[PDB]
Design a protein around this nucleic acid. Structure first.
Ligand SMILES: [Cl-]
Ligand SMILES: [Mn+2]
Ligand SMILES: [Mn+2]
Lengths: 95, 98, 107, 82, 91, 103, 96, 77
DNA sequence: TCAATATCCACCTGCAGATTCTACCAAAAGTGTATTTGGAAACTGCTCCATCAAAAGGCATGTTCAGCTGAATTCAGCTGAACATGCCTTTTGATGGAGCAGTTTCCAAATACACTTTTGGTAGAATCTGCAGGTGGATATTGAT
DNA sequence: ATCAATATCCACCTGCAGATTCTACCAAAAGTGTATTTGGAAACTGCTCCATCAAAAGGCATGTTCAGCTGAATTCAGCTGAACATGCCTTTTGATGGAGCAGTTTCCAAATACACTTTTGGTAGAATCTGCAGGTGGATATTGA
């Protein structure tokens, strides 16, 4: 009787506060940001999906994701992209 | 009476509308057109307040973008006035209908 | 002991679990490694952080403390890389970068 | 009431305005009818698909996602509606 | 091991043009074609299902997807021949 | 064979396995494979028919890529459908702009 | 006897459009292919066919780009494609 | 890239149906072709590498062409 | 045209590289049975969307005028096509050796399940507050003398 | 080289429609204890993929001549921009009726899962064949006179 819908709204806002503590974002802009993350999400995962397949694999590893990222993102966006990922996965396994 | 030379207000407007983001087509006429076109595909259709807004966002966007390529096509012909052929070339190259 | 959200575990703001659940229910693959959700949440977090930064700056330049689309557009269209990444995308309400062909300007 | 010839609703001052944001300083007179022709084609194609999605979902209402998914098909990916 | 639509394309080749044969490469082009469309059609069908919170791709998905994927008369005809084949296979 | 049951040449079995092993959906309905197969067949039919003609027209009895392109690009609909595809060894439809011609 | 300027061209055009063979020299291309590749990864090895793909793709693209180029030159009243034309076409196609 | 001789380019521009060619075109065309290849190949390789291989098969190219919206028929699907 | 190139262009024809056709051996595809489910059918709560009514001013229209842009010519400088040459880098053709895609065959590590708690998020309400919309001189930017 | 004539800036104002926060339930991650696999890892093929090595032969590079294409410079008919007056229709605001999304239940009809038996389709011989590739002989398409 309620119908709960989800978005990365809360998360975007958390990241918004880290970069600019004094800045804020509007609903519409929060919407734009929501589309962004999904678009990208589907792009990354979809490419991931292909990689695994072209390679007769039934599991998408964090490795596929990364090559996906290389194929999808341009220049430094990708360089920096991969750095955060790797760091994130290394830190995760260790703790 | 004071009079601005031709082209001077054209440039004035360009700066004006490029600095803003509001929609340039009047809302009602567009909603009307959307229903007419949609009606000729399926009868008794209904539209979300937003669905129409979406369409109008896409449309304006598409057209403004076409006019840019359009204008680069007039400039290439040493002209300064966009024409249909300027619009058609742009769409041929784009691949909309070669 | 007390539970560690997998995200905090990797030191990420985005939801690693939400991401894992969307990877599975997505039908992208039969199975999903434990590192993928993590890795991906991270790439999405950083990309979000990247456009948010340039947007804020643009909000600053215009004497506003609230980011609106125009700012996102301005952000996306001025950086070469984000502009290429979001080349076939249109931001509702984002307008266009002010740009006048040189030939059209006065004599 | 019967909807007819509403493509004419897209006035000339409007098309100019859209041409201004495009960066056009001078507009040929034939442009107006040509622009309408193109807009009506764009719309058709995007609405056609939208509705196809409304039909497969068995709804009487075209929703915003319908449009968005539709725009996505024609590679005119919209941000801000879902 | 390895597989291709060479056999089936060739069979179809024969019905329409009994007298003509098809080269290697040309055969290769036809294979590329089938796969592609297959993917496009199957891909979209996957998408329809998903938007509709469905977990099963019915032939209805296939059909609708084909309406979205194929142009004009190619589309009309495609729905027919495929609907015809199901009507027939089912009974 | 399911394919003869549906009166088709194309493997309805092969496609069903392709859809199952494809990641397209959680589960695949019985009519799906049939339906699609037939569509892959028909489209194939259609392109071969035109190629034939082309080959025939060229005086050959063997369909080659060039015949396929001619077939494809001459028809508007197939051209829309394979608009972002290139047939290897296809060549291009002969077309010379009027202005470039001798006056 | 001398064929007036440009007459041959039309005969060159009619000719080359009529064929479907590649028109770039096999070895120089393959040499080009390997070279670029090696700047990305080393001790790579190409399938004979892989180079055919790359060449098929390159030529096809290039011929296509020229059709759009020509159209841009004609549009400016010129009959000789120039670099601005090639740039215009690419700029409109969305390549840069 | 200089291996891509001027008389071959002319041929390419000929199939494209071009009657007359400015002299600068050639260096220009060489530029563009270089970018094409660089982009198509980088992706091919990435794909080659993901497969943990030392050989760029014809399929890798095929896949990378798809990604660049330049789909190719005749070597795989 | 009348002529004198140089070009295409069907007509005919002869084999080797492909094609297409055989002949068999595994991998799927089909059966038979037994289950798990997905999601169509049956309510029905209720947002949201279709419609209308009013007052009001924002703007689309249509007309005058005339500035200056597009287009039509004309001209000649010199760039890019047609050529006949001279020479060498591509062709290709084996011939061979060997890096390496591809197959196995185990198996330890990483996943999937199936439940049971334990939070993190979302959907309302309660609180705030940028900033939209106006106002007003300061500052150019234009266009006439 | 000046100056009205106008439009464009920029800062100060201030209520209010659009965030920011504040709180309660709950759908969903998190935590464990099993029940499979998945896809590396040694071992090794049979490949295709490099490498020479070695001649010929188109095919590329050149340096001449000039034909005609690009480029720049005027001129002027008239198209389209700027403006004003007119008065229509799109906006704004809110009111209602109710069609038809969606959220739950209920449960057959249908898809999934093995375990097995049959048949088909992919390979590598064996057996035809279509075009490739020249080679005449004869209108064609060009270009000069
Ligand atoms: Cl240039
Ligand atoms: Mn109608
Ligand atoms: Mn021949």
């Amino acid at each position: 009787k309620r119908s709960r819908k989800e978005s990365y709204s809360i998360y975007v806002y958390k990241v918004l506060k880290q970069v600019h503590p004094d800045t804020g974002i509007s609903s519409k802009a929060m919407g734009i940001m929501n589309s962004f993350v999904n678009d990208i999400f589907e792009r990354i995962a979809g490419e991931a999906s292909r990689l695994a397949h072209y390679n007769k694999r039934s599991t998408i590893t964090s490795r596929e994701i990364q090559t996906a990222v290389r194929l999808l993102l341009p220049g430094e966006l990708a360089k920096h992209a991969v750095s955060e990922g790797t760091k994130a996965v290394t830190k995760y396994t260790s703790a | 009476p004071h009079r601005y030379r031709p082209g001077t207000v054209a440039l004035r407007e360009i700066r004006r509308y490029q600095k803003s983001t509001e929609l340039l087509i009047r809302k009602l006429p567009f909603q009307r057109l959307v229903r007419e076109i949609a009606q000729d595909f399926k009868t008794d259709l209904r539209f979300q307040s937003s669905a129409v807004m979406a369409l109008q966002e896409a449309c304006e966007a598409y057209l403004v973008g076409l006019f840019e390529d359009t204008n680069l096509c007039a400039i290439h012909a040493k002209r300064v006035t966009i024409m249909p052929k300027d619009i058609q070339l742009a769409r041929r190259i784009r691949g909309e209908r070669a | 002991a007390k539970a560690k959200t997998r995200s905090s575990r990797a030191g990420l703001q985005f939801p690693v679990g939400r991401v894992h659940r969307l990877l599975r229910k997505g039908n992208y693959s039969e199975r999903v490694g434990a590192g993928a959700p993590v890795y991906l949440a991270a790439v999405l977090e950083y990309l979000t952080a990247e456009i948010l930064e340039l947007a804020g700056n643009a909000a600053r330049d215009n004497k506003k403390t609230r980011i609106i689309p125009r700012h996102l557009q301005l952000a996306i269209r001025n950086d070469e890389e984000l502009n290429k990444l979001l080349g076939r995308v249109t931001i509702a309400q984002g307008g266009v970068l002010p740009n006048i062909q040189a030939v059209l300007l006065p004599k | 009431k019967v909807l007819r010839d509403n493509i004419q609703g897209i006035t000339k001052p409007a098309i100019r305005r859209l041409a201004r944001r495009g960066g056009v300083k001078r507009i040929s007179g034939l442009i107006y009818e040509e622009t309408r022709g193109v807009l009506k084609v764009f719309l058709e194609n995007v609405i056609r698909d939208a509705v196809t999605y409304t039909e497969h979902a068995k709804r009487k209402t075209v929703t915003a996602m319908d449009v968005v998914y539709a725009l996505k098909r024609q590679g005119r990916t919209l941000y801000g509606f879902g």
